[PDB]
Amino acid sequence: AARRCQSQLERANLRPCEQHLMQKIQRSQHQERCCNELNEFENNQRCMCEALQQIMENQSDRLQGRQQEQQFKRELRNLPQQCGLRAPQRCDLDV
């Protein structure tokens, strides 16, 4: 169960989610791909959470300050919903 999610995450291409979120903040090509990728974790709360957490992990070094960090987190919490998916009820994104 926990190992099965480990393997699904190694197989995932969540870079379009990063791009969709960064271009969404700058103001789709990447949303269609990102949502298909997030769909692999739909209705699996622990694994959807870990995916969102790994997106935060990958983006921690590339954000320029706390305020940019909080704006990115906000947009990330809305990404499952904007894909027609359920977010996890609880998921710590403080990396």
């Epitope: 987190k73 906000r74 919490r77 919903q81 359920r86 996890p88 009820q89 609880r90």
Partner: antibody, heavy 121, light 108 residues
């Protein structure tokens, strides 16, 4: 340390209007959904509506759609419920609620003190 | 609206008994099922979230199980403070809905 301080409510005639307000501290109000729940005398809990942090996502229970309006002011850390076209059925204690996290699925956790709303001629 | 149907509506038991409350959803809600306790005059307290996860401070005697449409709250060894009303609650889709509630009374 979460505090939810409600105000308003009271007595109103059928067909009248009341406005409930709720002020929050101790969490990131602007990132959190917020919801209103009521409980009539001797009845069960009845979920009514919630509002996303941005205000762009809103849902209403079938029993209230078209009569109540939820809104929020993140700068005041407050969420409001405009109750219109009230009926005797609406008599209940009304609760402000905060969820356990900052997603649209996060379950209610912290409750305001409750406000008694009485609809009677 | 997703209809949440709890059974039984009432239940009597003694200190030390094993209680089980069931909740049936109108449709598949995955694990997005929550359980609350309410004592009279007081606001509800969350016991379980995500259909299996204990909230902080909730004693271990409370246990939740189920996925999809059928769910169960169990109290392994009932205690004096456990006599109250219990509600299930889905946050799978809005508008959210509580079950009608289950009152747990003292047997004699």
């Amino acid at each position: 340390q979460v505090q939810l301080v409600q105000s308003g409510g009271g007595l109103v005639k059928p067909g009248g209007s009341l406005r409930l307000s709720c002020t929050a501290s101790g969490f990131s109000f602007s990132d959190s959904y917020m919801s209103w729940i009521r409980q009539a005398p001797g009845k069960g809990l009845e979920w009514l509506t919630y509002i996303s942090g941005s205000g762009e996502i809103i849902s209403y229970a079938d029993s209230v759609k078209g009569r109540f309006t939820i809104s929020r002011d993140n700068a005041k850390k407050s969420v409001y419920l405009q109750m219109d076209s009230l009926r005797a059925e609406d008599t209940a204690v009304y609760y402000c609620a905060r969820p356990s996290d900052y997603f649209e699925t996060s379950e209610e956790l912290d409750w305001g003190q409750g406000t008694l709303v009485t609809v009677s001629s | 609206e997703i209809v949440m149907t709890q059974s039984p509506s009432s239940l009597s038991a003694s200190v030390g008994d094993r209680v089980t409350i069931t909740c049936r959803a109108s449709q598949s809600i995955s694990t997005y099922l929550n359980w609350y306790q309410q004592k009279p005059g007081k606001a509800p307290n969350l016991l379980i979230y995500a259909a299996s996860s204990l909230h902080s401070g909730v004693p271990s005697r409370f246990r939740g199980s189920g996925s999809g449409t059928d769910f169960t709250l169990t109290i392994t060894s009932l205690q004096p403070d456990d006599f109250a009303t219990y509600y299930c609650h889905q946050s799978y889709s809005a508008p959210r809905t509580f079950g009608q509630g289950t009152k747990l009374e003292i047997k004699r």
